[PDB]
Design a protein around this ligand. Sequence first.
Ligand SMILES: [Ca+2]
Ligand SMILES: [Cl-]
Ligand SMILES: [Cl-]
Ligand SMILES: [Cl-]
Ligand SMILES: [Cl-]
Ligand SMILES: [Fe+2]
Ligand SMILES: [Fe+2]
Ligand SMILES: [Fe+2]
Ligand SMILES: [Fe+2]
Lengths: 355, 354, 359, 359
Amino acid sequence: EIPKPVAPAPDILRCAYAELVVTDLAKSRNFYVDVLGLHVSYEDENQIYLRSFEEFIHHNLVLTKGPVAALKAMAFRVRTPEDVDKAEAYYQELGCRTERRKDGFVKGIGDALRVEDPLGFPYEFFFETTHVERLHMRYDLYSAGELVRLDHFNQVTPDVPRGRKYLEDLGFRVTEDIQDDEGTTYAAWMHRKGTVHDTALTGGNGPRLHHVAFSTHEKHNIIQICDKMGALRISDRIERGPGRHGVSNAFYLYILDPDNHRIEIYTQDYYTGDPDNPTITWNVHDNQRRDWWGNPVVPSWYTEASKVLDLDGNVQEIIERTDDSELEVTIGADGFSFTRAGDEDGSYHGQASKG
Amino acid sequence: EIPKPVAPAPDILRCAYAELVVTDLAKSRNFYVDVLGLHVSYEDENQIYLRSFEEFIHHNLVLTKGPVAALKAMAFRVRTPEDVDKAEAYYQELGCRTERRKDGFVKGIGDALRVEDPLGFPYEFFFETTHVERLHMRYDLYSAGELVRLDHFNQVTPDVPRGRKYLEDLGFRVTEDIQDDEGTTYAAWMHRKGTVHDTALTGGNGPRLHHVAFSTHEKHNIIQICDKMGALRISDRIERGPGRHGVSNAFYLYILDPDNHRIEIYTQDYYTGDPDNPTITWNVHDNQRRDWWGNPVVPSWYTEASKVLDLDGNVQEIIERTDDSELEVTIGADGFSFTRAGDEDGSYHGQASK
Amino acid sequence: EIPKPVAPAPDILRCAYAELVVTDLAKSRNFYVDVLGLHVSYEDENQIYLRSFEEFIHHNLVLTKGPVAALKAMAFRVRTPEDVDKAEAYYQELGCRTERRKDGFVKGIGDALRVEDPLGFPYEFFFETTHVERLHMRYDLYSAGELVRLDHFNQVTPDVPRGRKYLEDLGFRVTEDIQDDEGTTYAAWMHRKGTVHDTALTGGNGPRLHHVAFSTHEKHNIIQICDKMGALRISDRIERGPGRHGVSNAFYLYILDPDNHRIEIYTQDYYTGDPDNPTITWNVHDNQRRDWWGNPVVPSWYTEASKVLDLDGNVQEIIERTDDSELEVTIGADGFSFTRAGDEDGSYHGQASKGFKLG
Amino acid sequence: EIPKPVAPAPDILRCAYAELVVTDLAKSRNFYVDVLGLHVSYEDENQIYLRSFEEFIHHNLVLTKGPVAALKAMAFRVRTPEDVDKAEAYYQELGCRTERRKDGFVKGIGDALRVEDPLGFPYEFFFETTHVERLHMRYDLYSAGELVRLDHFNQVTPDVPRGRKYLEDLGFRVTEDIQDDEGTTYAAWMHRKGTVHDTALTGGNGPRLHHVAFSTHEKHNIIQICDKMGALRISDRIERGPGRHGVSNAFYLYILDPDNHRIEIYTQDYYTGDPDNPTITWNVHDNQRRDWWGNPVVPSWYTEASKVLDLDGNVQEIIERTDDSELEVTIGADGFSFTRAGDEDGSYHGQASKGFKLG
Ligand SMILES: [Ca+2]
Ligand SMILES: [Cl-]
Ligand SMILES: [Cl-]
Ligand SMILES: [Cl-]
Ligand SMILES: [Cl-]
Ligand SMILES: [Fe+2]
Ligand SMILES: [Fe+2]
Ligand SMILES: [Fe+2]
Ligand SMILES: [Fe+2]
């Protein structure tokens, strides 16, 4: 239903950075720099440019002061300068609004194309970026909870099949998804860079940004983030985890920034770069699909997500999902989940796992 | 009100083993050997004797086939052979029922005393044990989830101060506890060997055994146990965790065996050996006391625990706690907890966290 | 010196497997399966097919019984069936010997091309492969030392710039290298899959295969491999490490199989997938370039490597390196190394670091 | 031939702190605070008092500015105030020089006794100490290389059985030792607190202090210390390691402070608190006894150690070892070591393991 354009898709390398509008620049700086340990590439009174430990492009996160907290741009890096032209021609044919700046929208990025995509998300495509010192061996700066890479975005959208087809035509490959036996798709994960994903689609009212995810080297680094949050007595900002994912097989943690933007810390998924990488489909009632250890998913994780902006800086209107709700079918009043397929023992009726 | 005997206390070194009655020996073996990777010191059709990676005494766990799943004995090693005689005289003065077997109750233990202690728990005291190969450097046998030591027991009892004074007289020292402003004690941790505890008292209906705990080297070993349980599709047997404890500061996991005996896997508490080791008291309403990260404690963790047997092998009758319930005052309908004292942001009312 | 063909290079995805010839199959099986924990895809009296924990292709290593221990093939997977045709045309234009087998050289691989490449190495290109159970969440099988992926090969060749140009034309990008101030290149690392490398060139007499590398999830997994080797009283088979590499930033260990084939265990390098990824050049006299902690590199690491076979299965003749020797210029009698550039303190003259000399 | 006194031994709990004389207080501070991350309890122009992450007594390390770098005191905490009096009577009966200060020798310690012990070492015994904030849950301060406890001292002394007998009479129990088949003892480990050791005796010219050891929680913490030293371009101050010890089974690293005082970082030894804890004797030629992975012991580890002071602040005279040297019998020109006892394969004669000889 989103048609495949005749124009070639641009060659997208990876997710590269997010621009997030925040309301109190000092509080957010404290969260992202003081608590999480991200590295400042540039800052002034309006913006903070932050990067992970192993990054060499200018930034992975731009915090921009504004009146309404929201995603302003989710940016992917393309292979060549000519891929920014291809992106522009591709989104024109799709009838999408686009805006092209030879000198970039944020500091440290050159020629860039921003678009309101067919799902209502603000995508940016760019090649040119100002290189900075790669801190990958600066173990003199390395913190016990060090965030090493930007890994993915996760987007909330009402119709997952619709979005999936569009991203596949754009060159993303589905690695895992969640479905039921009645034809509904609840979520899908897709990649360009050869990890489990660069973005993911989560079925719900949208467009909204569910989260932005950063990686650590090891599982103990994620444990340390939790421990530090307890020491700072902000354990209430730990939403969910730590855990092992079923889908993706990664060790994880979800935390909430001062504007409630959700950040995931993630480590140790697997290689997906082969073009016939086997796709894995989970059943929506399988209680090990989201947390492998069967720990319950808190309802806020399903219902809460960040607003997104259009190209003019106004909030995108939210469209309701009419397909079945992952929350309702697993943990709501008429919900169901199993530990072992076909086994009544270890199954949950009308409530979440673990009592 | 448990009187201090004039007879000297036995010198207790550490918690050493538990004997657990199980209903299906083969299923239990599958859990303790095939899933958890404990090492077989002896087995036959009626019992399995198991030990941890770094142990040199005969065993840390005995699984005995019986009709009713229950704790049959929680055993402490004493410093000398004479300490068994001291234990006998001590418990006889307390008016407790005792039984002395010069050749032991279980294989690989020699002269031993079992008692029905004043809290109704079956304690064993012994010195003599058959030494076995210490597997501490057998990395050829080392599992990704390796259990390296027995760390502690945790006992459910209705009146914590009563039990705590009795254990102090036995030479245990309290390291941490949970209290409220009204003066109720909900739990206490106490030690002999210089870790946070060898046993602990949890307020509730008892005598019941809350859990037995084993230690791993590192946090990743606990993660692996969870991961393996997912792979075996037995994640419903993960009860609580993994987490960081507030009390003890240890990384932890609670799992349930086939008869619902609860096992804790535990690592990285701190040294308590100095006699003036500072005691830490947590408020019962502090949401970081049990899980430092503020994760909720599932009601089953407070309400479910194992039966204990008397010396004849019958189940000990339960006495109901009359002091306030930690479940009720934190997560029950009129309960509450906080992240930051005095702050309504991050506080939970009539409701658990997260 | 090696010309760029007019024919397009095949689109290479990644290193996929190696076929090693071994002299005693049962001894090699004990090393790779019982010691290292690799998973058996297939075996018989003549071959063992092994894979890592996260692999879905049929195998990452084939051990083949033969009279002379050697590398028989280093195989790269290509993106499409049509890329195998491209590889054939490309290598024919380079004037190399090639062999095409529609149903594969080894079990579990389909249409495959093997070539004697311009550096004398037996390369294989394939697309078609039998998928198997991907064991990535089989934590009921996971060992304390689990090998999760095949990561790279490392090749010994006498002229590194000559090979580097050829691999760049083939589509590999150099991520790191080691050079001196007098124009000599000692080593280069190059990738297709977006890690530090899929293969590497190490200057020395060749063609010889230096090692094959597998990855683990965490550093403690590499430690456990060492610990287990101690417990099995085969610590004499730990060649070098564990350590932190300067080049690649990975945590590492080198061990030796029963035929002296060198295996590296490797973890936690960085992403190189961007086309303008910064190339890092280390100076050969920098004592943190190979081991970041400054531990000395054992001389066998520089001198010993496995024979490689031609398409007929005969050993390839060795061509001697005439460029300067990394061993000689760093830890040899006229050698030099530094800890801090320009500082005499922490420098080493005619001997290795940490109080050692060449045996 | 150090007699057992009639007077009762003091009840020693554990090693508690060391007082090290250092020549440049600012440079030592950069090392212990900025590099290693210890926590400051008190400092001024003359001294810096440091503690580990889990400590509640005032300090584990006192750095005292002075003219000659040396160990000034190795302090053990005793169980009660009365035990300081027992210590005094005990050493007086041995005929040792003692000095008692009711208000301590350093800040944060109360009634204390220093003695010049029969091996020439300056020992302090105390009970009273100023309690400080226990930082064990201050994960807001926790570094990637955090030192969590003080674990042990290691002493160099010419006659190990003489020293061992004396420590046994003080209540220390031997856990492990190294010997040869002809009855020479090279080293012994002994404990009070239920870990492998609180102090250890290493055969050599002495009295000298070999090292002070701190523990970390996990192996990755020790790896981070190396990684950080590499980043700071002070890898030349990594003496030996990281490794796994044979004796003790601990993961370890040895580093050198600005005055060449050796610090060990140590983790994951085993419980020894039972009175019949099985002792383990290793053969001196076993190449897995010091490093379980067979990595060679750097010669400086055998030859270099810190001076110790007498109670007036003067350096103690050094007495030479007349028994065999561990260095000489294992890695010297006439030395040997084995991987498997009796097996020539994996054995080393006249040189160290892994292909190095002595520099
Ligand atoms: Ca030069
Ligand atoms: Cl999830
Ligand atoms: Cl708890
Ligand atoms: Cl290297
Ligand atoms: Cl050693
Ligand atoms: Fe995610
Ligand atoms: Fe416990
Ligand atoms: Fe390599
Ligand atoms: Fe030591």
